[PDB]
């Protein structure tokens, strides 16, 4: 293992500096003996996923906060954690020298890193692209004879995905999402602006658009890539907005319902891609539960829909019971999955804040909140950006857990990276969230899960400046005595048998 090389940039914490010959990394996962726990600690003061161990105690006597594991109270099973292979992410990664490229990929996907097992792939161009294109720009080609993948896929995105798969500790699932259709399918004839598919579900435009999903999966499979799921449209509400600045395709919930029932569902089911799962919404959670009710109460759409994809954007501190919680209650067998999260800013504020602990805490608070309201996975946006938060053809710059500086053959791992890693590294696919109850009201955010092998994982986030003494009770093994320092995040692991 190699430790973090810290660097400050004027915010309240540090980034970790990596280059062609050095990156902070982990030793192979080792689980300590029954009766012992492991603790990984990150702090604003600078600690980065630092490992310590301790004994589980047979008794506990004080007052002070007690968190009791309820292993018999079982909730959702986890699908996974990951991020998005945008054009911008691919360009930033490939700007590094090859050894630095591989250290970046290992940081995300290998057991030397934080064990990502999800990659989101845009279908053709989005705002984090430097060229505007779709896969079928030759007009009025309704049978899509001229559909083809450009070099953005065949030279950049697809080889990088394959390199991640080869480095991965765990099986990786790919999820695809389109931003815009070809413009000759659209009411406004442009990739952006207010506009939807022409006509109505069932007609030539909607049939061709569904066929485009099949052609996309066809083309990626020719390159030996296959998809766990697709979403019906990235952020369908965006294309309803006058002047929307980048690639979009507008759907009301009724339009999405009928597109799924008449075109997308049947087209996918009638193809060799019938096992690919379809996720609806792919948008922010205040559209719930209304969007889910519109789509899923129609049996002819619901029979094709596997789950509901939700975005986090500018709402990291907002509630979740009336949106995620209520949607789970109404549709308890329809999985909820967070497919995109990123930290935006006001127009006059800075897009990237190198070393911001606050943005890290936003990620971990969002992840805990999602997990506590039945969400099965959480997907970051761009895997890497430059120090401007780009490139981005409309200058819609945002932050990213990894910032690449091409002029120094260097990349910086933000607090966001480690806050996400406190979950992704230690919560493999199939882990089940279990109950965790507090003995008294407190300011900590915490979640407990049980690995498929039966061991326990608890994440504890302290967004306050005050240390909080804390004990975790597991009736199978005893008491875990610890302290949650102010401005810290901890992951605790222990064997139960």
């Amino acid at each position, epitope marked *: 293992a190699r430790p973090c090389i810290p660097k400050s940039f004027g915010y309240s914490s540090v980034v970790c500096v990596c280059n062609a010959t050095y990156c902070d990394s982990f030793d192979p996962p080792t689980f300590p003996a029954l009766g012992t726990f492991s603790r990984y600690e990150s702090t604003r003061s600078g600690r980065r996923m630092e490992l310590s161990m301790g004994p589980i105690q047979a008794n506990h006597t004080g007052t002070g906060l007690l968190l009791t594991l309820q292993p018999e109270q079982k909730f959702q*099973k986890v*699908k996974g954690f990951g991020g998005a292979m945008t054009d911008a992410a691919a360009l930033n990664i490939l700007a590094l020298s090859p050894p630095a490229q591989n250290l970046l990929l290992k940081s995300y996907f290998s057991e030397e890193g934080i064990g990502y097992n999800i*990659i989101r792939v845009p279908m053709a161009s989005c705002d984090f692209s430097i060229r505007t294109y779709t896969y079928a720009d030759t007009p009025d080609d309704f049978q899509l004879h001229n559909f083809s993948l450009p070099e953005e896929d065949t030279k950049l995105k697809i080889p990088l*995905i*394959h390199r991640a*798969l080869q480095l991965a500790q*765990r*099986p*990786v*699932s*790919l999820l695809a999402s389109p931003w815009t259709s070809p413009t000759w399918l659209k009411t406004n004839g442009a990739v952006n602006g207010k506009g939807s598919l022409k006509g109505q579900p069932g007609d030539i435009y909607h049939q061709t658009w569904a066929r485009y999903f099949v052609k996309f999966l066809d083309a990626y*499979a020719e390159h*030996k*890539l*296959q998809f*766990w799921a697709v979403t019906a449209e990235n952020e369908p509400s965006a294309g309803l907005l006058s002047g929307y600045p980048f690639q979009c395709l507008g759907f009301t919930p009724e339009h999405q319902r009928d597109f799924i029932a008449r075109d997308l569902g049947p087209t996918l089911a009638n193809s*060799t891609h*019938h*096992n690919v*799962r379809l996720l609806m919404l792919d948008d922010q959670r205040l559209l719930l539960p209304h969007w889910a009710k519109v789509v899923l109460t129609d049996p002819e759409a619901a029979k094709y829909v*596997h789950g509901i994809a939700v975005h986090w954007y500018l709402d990291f501190l907002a509630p979740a019971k009336a949106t995620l919680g209520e949607t789970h209650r109404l549709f308890p*067998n329809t*999985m909820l999955f967070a497919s995109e999260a990123c930290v935006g800013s006001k127009f006059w504020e800075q897009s990237v804040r190198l070393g911001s602990w606050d943005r890290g805490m936003q990620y971990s608070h969002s992840i805990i909140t999602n997990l506590l309201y039945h969400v099965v996975g959480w997907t970051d946006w761009n895997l890497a950006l430059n120090p401007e938060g780009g490139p981005n053809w409309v200058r819609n710059f945002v932050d990213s857990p990894i910032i690449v500086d091409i002029t120094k053959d260097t990349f910086y791992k933000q607090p966001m990276f480690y806050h996400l890693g406190h979950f992704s590294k230690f919560i493999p*696919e*199939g882990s089940q969230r279990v109950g965790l109850v507090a003995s008294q009201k407190n300011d900590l955010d915490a979640v407990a899960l049980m690995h*498929p092998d039966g061991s326990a994982v608890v994440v504890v986030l302290n967004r306050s400046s005050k240390d909080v003494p804390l004990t975790i009770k597991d009736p199978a093994v005893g008491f875990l005595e610890t302290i949650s320092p102010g401005y810290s995040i901890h992951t605790y692991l222990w064997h139960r048998q």
Partner: nanobody
Amino acid sequence: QVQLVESGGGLVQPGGSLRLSCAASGFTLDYYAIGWFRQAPGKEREGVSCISSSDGSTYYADSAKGRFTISRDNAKNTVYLQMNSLKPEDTAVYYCATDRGQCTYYSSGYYRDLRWYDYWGQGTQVTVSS
């Protein structure tokens, strides 16, 4: 000790039916996803059907879709493959295997990946002949 034992194979005529069983020991069926595979002589090993342990969702090869049904007996820790409308092209050794992911042959990133299936049964011969 992870053990998988296939049974139910044998000889059937074209159009006939067979139910294969994969008896699992050394783990519970809420742990591993379980897949059925085949190798027809002269062909590589191919997926037939898989069933997820996370949500019980089922996966099918194009040729199995609508003819075959995978299911679990959770009380007996057994995974069944009901095969209907068999044809001579279905003659093969049939194997069940534990998955390190959730039906990764169909769902994980590398097309038809077999890398994540970590335990395999010895298989059972199915012959479809007049």
